[PDB]
Amino acid sequence: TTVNFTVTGEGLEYTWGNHPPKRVWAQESGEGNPHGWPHEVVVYYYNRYPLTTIIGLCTCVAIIMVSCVTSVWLLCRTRNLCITPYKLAPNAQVPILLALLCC
Amino acid sequence: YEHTAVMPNKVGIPYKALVERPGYAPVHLQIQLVNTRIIPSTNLEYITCKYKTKVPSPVVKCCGATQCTSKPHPDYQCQVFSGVYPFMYGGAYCFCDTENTQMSEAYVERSEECSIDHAKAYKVHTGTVQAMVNITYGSVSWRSADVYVNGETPAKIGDAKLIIGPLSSAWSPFDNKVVVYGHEVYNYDFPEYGTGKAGSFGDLQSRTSTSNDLYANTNLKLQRPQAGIVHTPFTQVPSGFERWKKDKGAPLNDVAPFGCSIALEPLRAENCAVGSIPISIDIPDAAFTRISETPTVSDLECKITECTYAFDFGGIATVAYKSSKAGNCPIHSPSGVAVIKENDVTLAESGSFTFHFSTANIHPAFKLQVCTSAVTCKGDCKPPKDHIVDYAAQHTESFTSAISATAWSWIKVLVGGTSAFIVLGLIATAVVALVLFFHRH
Amino acid sequence: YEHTAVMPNKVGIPYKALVERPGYAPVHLQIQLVNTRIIPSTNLEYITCKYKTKVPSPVVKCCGATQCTSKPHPDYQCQVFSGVYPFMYGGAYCFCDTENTQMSEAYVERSEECSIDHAKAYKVHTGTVQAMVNITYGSVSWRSADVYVNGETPAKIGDAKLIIGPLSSAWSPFDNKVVVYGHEVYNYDFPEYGTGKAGSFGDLQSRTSTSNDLYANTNLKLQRPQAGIVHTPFTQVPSGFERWKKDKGAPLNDVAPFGCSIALEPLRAENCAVGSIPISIDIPDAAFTRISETPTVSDLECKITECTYAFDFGGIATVAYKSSKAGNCPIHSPSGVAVIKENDVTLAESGSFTFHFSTANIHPAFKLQVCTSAVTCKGDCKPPKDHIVDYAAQHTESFTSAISATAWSWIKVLVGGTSAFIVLGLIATAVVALVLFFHRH
Ligand SMILES: *[C@@H]1O[C@H](CO)[C@@H](O)[C@H](O)[C@H]1NC(C)=O
Numbered sequence: 001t002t003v004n005f006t007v008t009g010e011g012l013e014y015t016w017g018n019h020p021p022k023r024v025w026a027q028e029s030g031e032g033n034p035h036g037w038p039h040e041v042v043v044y045y046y047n048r049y050p051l052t053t054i055i056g057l058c059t060c061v062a063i064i065m066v067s068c069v070t071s072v073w074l075l076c077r078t079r080n081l082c083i084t085p086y087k088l089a090p091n092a093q094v095p096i097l098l099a100l101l102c103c
Numbered sequence: 104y105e106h107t108a109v110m111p112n113k114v115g116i117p118y119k120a121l122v123e124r125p126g127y128a129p130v131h132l133q134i135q136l137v138n139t140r141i142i143p144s145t146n147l148e149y150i151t152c153k154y155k156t157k158v159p160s161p162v163v164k165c166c167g168a169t170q171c172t173s174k175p176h177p178d179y180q181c182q183v184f185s186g187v188y189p190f191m192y193g194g195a196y197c198f199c200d201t202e203n204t205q206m207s208e209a210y211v212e213r214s215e216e217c218s219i220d221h222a223k224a225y226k227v228h229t230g231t232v233q234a235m236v237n238i239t240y241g242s243v244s245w246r247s248a249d250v251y252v253n254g255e256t257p258a259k260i261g262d263a264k265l266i267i268g269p270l271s272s273a274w275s276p277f278d279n280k281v282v283v284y285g286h287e288v289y290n291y292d293f294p295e296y297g298t299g300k301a302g303s304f305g306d307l308q309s310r311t312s313t314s315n316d317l318y319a320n321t322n323l324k325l326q327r328p329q330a331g332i333v334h335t336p337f338t339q340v341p342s343g344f345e346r347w348k349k350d351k352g353a354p355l356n357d358v359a360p361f362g363c364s365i366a367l368e369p370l371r372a373e374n375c376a377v378g379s380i381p382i383s384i385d386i387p388d389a390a391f392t393r394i395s396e397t398p399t400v401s402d403l404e405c406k407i408t409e410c411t412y413a414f415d416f417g418g419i420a421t422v423a424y425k426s427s428k429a430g431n432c433p434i435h436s437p438s439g440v441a442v443i444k445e446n447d448v449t450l451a452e453s454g455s456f457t458f459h460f461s462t463a464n465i466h467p468a469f470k471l472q473v474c475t476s477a478v479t480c481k482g483d484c485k486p487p488k489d490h491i492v493d494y495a496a497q498h499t500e501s502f503t504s505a506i507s508a509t510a511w512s513w514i515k516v517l518v519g520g521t522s523a524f525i526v527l528g529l530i531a532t533a534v535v536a537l538v539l540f541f542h543r544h
Numbered sequence: 545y546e547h548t549a550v551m552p553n554k555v556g557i558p559y560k561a562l563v564e565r566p567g568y569a570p571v572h573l574q575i576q577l578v579n580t581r582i583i584p585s586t587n588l589e590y591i592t593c594k595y596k597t598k599v600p601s602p603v604v605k606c607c608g609a610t611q612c613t614s615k616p617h618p619d620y621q622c623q624v625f626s627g628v629y630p631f632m633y634g635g636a637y638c639f640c641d642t643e644n645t646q647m648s649e650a651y652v653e654r655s656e657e658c659s660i661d662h663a664k665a666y667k668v669h670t671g672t673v674q675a676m677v678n679i680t681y682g683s684v685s686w687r688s689a690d691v692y693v694n695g696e697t698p699a700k701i702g703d704a705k706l707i708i709g710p711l712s713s714a715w716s717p718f719d720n721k722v723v724v725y726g727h728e729v730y731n732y733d734f735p736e737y738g739t740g741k742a743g744s745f746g747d748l749q750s751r752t753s754t755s756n757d758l759y760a761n762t763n764l765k766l767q768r769p770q771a772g773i774v775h776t777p778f779t780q781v782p783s784g785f786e787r788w789k790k791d792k793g794a795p796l797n798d799v800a801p802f803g804c805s806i807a808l809e810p811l812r813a814e815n816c817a818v819g820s821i822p823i824s825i826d827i828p829d830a831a832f833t834r835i836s837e838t839p840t841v842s843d844l845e846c847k848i849t850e851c852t853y854a855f856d857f858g859g860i861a862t863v864a865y866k867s868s869k870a871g872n873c874p875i876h877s878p879s880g881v882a883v884i885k886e887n888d889v890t891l892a893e894s895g896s897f898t899f900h901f902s903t904a905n906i907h908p909a910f911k912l913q914v915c916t917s918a919v920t921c922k923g924d925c926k927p928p929k930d931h932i933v934d935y936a937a938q939h940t941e942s943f944t945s946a947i948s949a950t951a952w953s954w955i956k957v958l959v960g961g962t963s964a965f966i967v968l969g970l971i972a973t974a975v976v977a978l979v980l981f982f983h984r985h
Pocket residue numbers: 002003004
């Protein structure tokens with residue numbers, strides 16, 4: 001029969017009948033390229049840290065979504081507050097600089 | 104000079120340090136544990152083994168009857184069977200056809216094998232912790248002695264006074280109750296003396312293997328002899344010691360966490376890699392040499408020529424130097440980034456030397472101490488090729504050990520970019536807020 | 545028939561009960577503890593005693609000099625004294641005047657008295673609890689046996705099987721570390737082996753009284769011999785064992801709470817009155833008589849003829865009765881108010897009998913279980929006259945034991961009066977609110 005055991009850096013010991021127990025340790029030789037492109041970096045850390053990478057990536061995306069939505073929401077809020085004083089006054093100066101920063 | 108530090112509770116992985124006594128050149132210190140033994144206090148509760156049933160000659164009363172009496176024997180049974188007409192080699196034993204009785208007796212004994220084949224039930228309490236420590240320092244060769252890991256009792260090893268602090272973890276693989284059979288130890292909540300059940304582990308119990316007061320609990324029942332036959336038949340529950348030996352399961356020797364090795368003389372758990380060990384060693388004053396009496400090392404430049412973050416000493420570094428009064432100079436890395444294989448080097452007035460190191464870091468950056476001097480070593484390390492090795496890691500892995508410069512760059516952009524987006528939104532809000540004020544004013 | 549109950553952990557005070565088996569007349573049961581022993585598990589740490597200083601013959605080198613060497617003797621000292629010109633009975637020992645040398649040696653060893661006069665340092669762990677129990681039931685006389693208070697291990701006492709539950713309290717008078725000296729036990733936090741200080745308890749330490757590895761820490765210093773005299777003078781800190789004897793203080797034998805008595809073989813604490821003890825006893829079936837075969841008692845009238853709530857059986861009561869068969873009848877009081885002195889009484893066809901009881905109540909009221917029947921006894925008890933007695937109380941006092949009828953009268957009036965006055969105000973408050981309502985409506 002063939003038996004497959006998971007071995008970590010903490011080590012694993014196995015005893016085959018009437019033989020002295022043998023101890024083996026796994027090295028950090030997972031496949032990937034931590035110095036390559038983003039798809040290669042994530043693969044390396046996923047293979048080395050499966051759960052941490054999954055949790056880490058979700059946290060990064062969640063942070064980006066909240067920050068980008070908040071950033072754009074404030075910028076949209078800026079345009080509404082910045083332009084409204086001129087929307088209600090058709091006969092207004094409306095400086096050209098306004099059309100470049102608040103639009 | 105007393106040196107105090109904390110070393111991990113690891114066996115076979117040496118602890119290295121430089122003992123720096125003000126005014127004297129550093130003395131390299133190396134402390135290696137040969138074994139660590141958790142030796143609990145044990146109280147034998149009772150001894151269990153396979154029973155033997157003793158059956159004395161039955162009393163055959165012809166043309167009459169007899170009566171049973173109680174006796175002080177373990178699981179003693181006695182019964183009188185009337186209406187027997189036994190036959191022997193010489194013919195009918197009794198004259199009367201039915202007015203005859205046979206009184207059968209039986210009781211339980213320890214078998215002859217009980218002197219060698221028995222299980223010992225122990226109560227286990229906190230005991231002591233001992234270790235074998237192998238120590239070398241300076242130019243003194245390796246010396247070792249057995250020590251008590253309690254932080255109080257000193258040990259004299261090669262003119263050095265060693266006090267090994269108590270283990271930071273009070274963890275022990277033994278429960279309050281263990282059973283020792285042969286070389287194997289089992290964590291087993293054995294029944295109290297006098298309460299063992301028939302066909303189970305405690306059916307037969309003895310306070311000691313040579314006692315004369317034995318507890319036995321088997322369904323020993325005398326059966327009626329077969330017609331015309333003189334014998335003492337009985338039924339009994341099969342021995343629970345033989346049953347237990349079949350259903351023992353995995354011993355503590357095979358399931359103990361932290362790699363503990365279980366030994367019996369005395370009962371102890373060896374090499375359990377739990378916690379850390381405070382240490383304090385008093386180095387002889389004669390082992391220290393004054394700074395002005397040792398070589399001066401300067402102009403150090405460290406180059407990593409090869410590196411892989413394998414469990415072995417996969418790193419190779421070359422250090423260029425200039426010095427004076429050529430002679431031996433200890434080498435040490437105070438940080439945990441890299442473990443140095445060499446303990447000392449011989450320095451000329453100028454040249455370079457090489458050393459090997461073990462690191463888990465993908466981009467190691469560590470300080471190397473060269474007696475009275477230090478240099479910073481930096482480089483990149485490639486992944487190890489072997490998936491599985493038969494030896495433990497020399498280095499220690501940190502949270503940030505695996506993070507590459509590329510990964511740090513992406514994290515820096517992630518945090519910097521995320522912040523920059525919010526900052527622009529906040530700046531725009533502040534600018535418009537002021538403009539709204541100036542409109543009214 | 546198994547009877548289960550909880551009895552107080554008291555020695556000399558009997559536990560009384562009626563074993564009530566459905567269909568059979570009650571069997572009076574009396575369980576009394578003769579002694580109770582807490583027997584902890586101990587491990588000898590080391591043995592301390594008064595030291596002896598061994599001084600070998602000095603080496604006197606004439607016209608020359610010698611050098612000292614290191615030896616394994618405990619607290620070994622060696623010093624070379626130059627410039628000696630010793631004299632003896634035969635004249636000047638050496639020829640040269642100032643070129644002679646004397647070598648002095650001394651070391652510490654156990655004294656001869658250490659074989660009898662020594663203190664044992666023990667580490668104490670939870671052990672076992674054992675007791676001697678005196679039991680009588682029905683018409684069977686008192687029988688006793690030594691038992692293990694585990695709650696599981698049964699004991700055979702006069703054909704009855706007793707199982708005694710563990711003590712409700714895990715309390716033990718022994719600390720984690722104790723010192724046993726003579727007949728005395730001290731809860732002394734002794735220093736670990738190898739860390740004893742000069743002039744203090746652990747200055748000399750030995751693992752056993754015969755050990756060849758002796759620890760000794762005394763400021764043993766060799767002094768220069770007197771001019772012209774051959775001897776080996778020295779100074780040393782007086783023994784810390786002799787000092788400890790002077791300052792050891794009060795032993796555990798004299799300060800243990802709960803009246804514990806301390807014994808050494810084995811080390812144990814006896815008769816500690818802590819908590820209560822669960823009990824389970826199987827009464828043999830032969831001890832029970834069918835109800836229809838026993839007397840029937842009726843028209844019981846109980847009169848308290850005299851009562852004092854003294855520690856002894858100061859209560860006297862008379863019970864009038866009528867009974868069939870004129871047989872013997874167990875007597876019991878299941879209420880905790882009073883303890884009955886007599887176990888059973890002899891009944892005639894009609895008449896009365898007296899019994900004695902001990903109660904703490906000023907106005908006792910208790911149920912007397914005349915076999916298969918019951919009568920309620922009520923009376924008034926006078927205060928005891930003796931201030932101090934040399935025997936323990938036979939009864940148990942409760943929160944309300946001392947509250948007299950007049951005390952209840954005042955409590956009832958004060959509590960009731962204030963409550964009624966509060967209610968009277970609230971009633972008036974509700975009515976006036978309605979009175980105002982009717983004015984508007
Ligand atoms: C063990 O792993 C190998 C992959 O090399 C696979 O082919 C095999 O089926 C596995 N065996 C079991 C029992 O999972």
